[PDB]
C-alpha cells in the first residue's frame, strides 16, 4: 500500500527553475525523513538533501546547497524539490525516497519513487532526418548482410525504429542516442540472411512522437 508518486517528466530551458513533487501514499511523511537523490546519465547516485516533514529541518549536500531547496507539505503529504538556474548539468533523473511509518518499521523495502526525468535544453522539437544505410557492395560477412538507418538531428527523445513495420525484429540493434550539437542522433542496424536481400525490400520506420512525424525509408 506504501507508494511514492512523483511528478511527470520535465523539459525546461536553461536559466529557468522547476519544482518537482513526490506524493506519498499509504503512509504519513511526518513519521519519517524524505530524501531526494539525483542520478546523472550513466553516472552514480548522488544524495541531494533530506527533510523532516515534522520540523521542516533540512540537511543538504554542500554542492547542492544554493541550487536546490527541499520543502514538504505534511497536509498534502507531499515533498518537493526546487531547482533554480538550470543548466545541462542538472539534467538527470531525480528520485525521492522515504521509509515506512515508525512503530519499528525501519525497513519496508524502499520507495525511491519512480523517478522524474529532467531535461534541460534550449532546443525546439525537431523531426529526425532519416538516411538509409546501404552496403558499398563488399562482402561484409560471408553470406549474410547488414543494413542500417541513420536518424539524425532530432529532439526531444525518444524515437521508435522498426524494420518492415515490425516484420523484422530479429538481429536488430538500435544504438542509444547521443547528443550532437544539441540534437540527438541514433542509428539502428539490421542483419538478415544474404538470401532475402536485395530480393525482398526492407524499410525502416522511424517515429518521433514529439513531432508527431513518422518516416519510412527504403534501402536500395
Amino acid at each position: 500500500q506504501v507508494q511514492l508518486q512523483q511528478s511527470g517528466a520535465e523539459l525546461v530551458r536553461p536559466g529557468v527553475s522547476v519544482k518537482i513533487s513526490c506524493k506519498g501514499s499509504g503512509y504519513t511523511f511526518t513519521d519519517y525523513a524524505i530524501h531526494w537523490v539525483k542520478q546523472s546519465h550513466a553516472k552514480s547516485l548522488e544524495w541531494i538533501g533530506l527533510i523532516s516533514t515534522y520540523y521542516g529541518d533540512a540537511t543538504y549536500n554542500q554542492n547542492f546547497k544554493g541550487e536546490a531547496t527541499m520543502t514538504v507539505d505534511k497536509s498534502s503529504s507531499t515533498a518537493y524539490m526546487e531547482l533554480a538556474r538550470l543548466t545541462s548539468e542538472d539534467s538527470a533523473i531525480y528520485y525521492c525516497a522515504r521509509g515506512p511509518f515508525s512503530r519499528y518499521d525501519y525497513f519496508a523495502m524502499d520507495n525511491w519513487g519512480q523517478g522524474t526525468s529532467v531535461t534541460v535544453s534550449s532546443a525546439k522539437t525537431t523531426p529526425p532526418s532519416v538516411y538509409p544505410l546501404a552496403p558499398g557492395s563488399a562482402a561484409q560477412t560471408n553470406s549474410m548482410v547488414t543494413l542500417g538507418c541513420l536518424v539524425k538531428g532530432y529532439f526531444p527523445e525518444p524515437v521508435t525504429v522498426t524494420w518492415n513495420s515490425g516484420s523484422l525484429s530479429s538481429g536488430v540493434h538500435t544504438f542509444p542516442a547521443v547528443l550532437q550539437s544539441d540534437l540527438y542522433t541514433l542509428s539502428s542496424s539490421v542483419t538478415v540472411p544474404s538470401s532475402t536481400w536485395p530480393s525482398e525490400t526492407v524499410t525502416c520506420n522511424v517515429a518521433h512522437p514529439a513531432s508527431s512525424t513518422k518516416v519510412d525509408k527504403k534501402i536500395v
Binding site: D31, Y32, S102, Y104, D105, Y106
Partner: protein, 173 residues
Amino acid sequence: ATTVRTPSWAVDMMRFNINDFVPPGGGTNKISIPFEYYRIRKVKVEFWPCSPITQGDRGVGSTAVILDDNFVTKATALTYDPYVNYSSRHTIPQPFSYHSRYFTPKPVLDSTIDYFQPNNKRNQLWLRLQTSANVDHVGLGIAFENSTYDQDYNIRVTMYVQFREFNLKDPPL
C-alpha cells in the same frame, strides 16, 4: 524480529480519541451515551503480552508519558533510547513482562500553543460530547528494544471518565 546485533530501539507513540471508545447512537440521540459533557479523570493503559515466558533474547523498554503532542519520531531501530532520562519514565521489561500505567490524560486544545492544566480534579474543565470531531488526547510515548523475535502485546487502554448533562431524547410512539 530484527537482525541488528547491536541494541536498537523501536519508538512509537499513543494518541487517544474517544470516538474510538464510543458507538454512535441512533434516532434523535446521535451518540449511544446520553450526556452532553465529559471529562476523563484517569487513563489506565495495560499491556498483555502474547510473548511466552519461555522466550529467549529478552529485553527491556521504557515508558515515559507524553502530554503535549511533541513526540519522539517513530523509528524502527534507534541507536539509543530517548526515553531514558524523562521524569515520567517507567521501566518495562521484554518480552513477556506485564506492564500498566495509571495516569491522567491531556487533550490537544491548540496545536500551535500546546497549553494544559496542572493536576487538578476540582478545576478539571469540561468537554462537549460531540458526534465525531472529538479531540485526541496525547497520552504516552513508548520505546521497544529490538529483538530477533517478534514481541506481541494485547494493549488495553482503560479510562475513568466523568460526565455531565444527561441529554436524552424520546420521540413519541
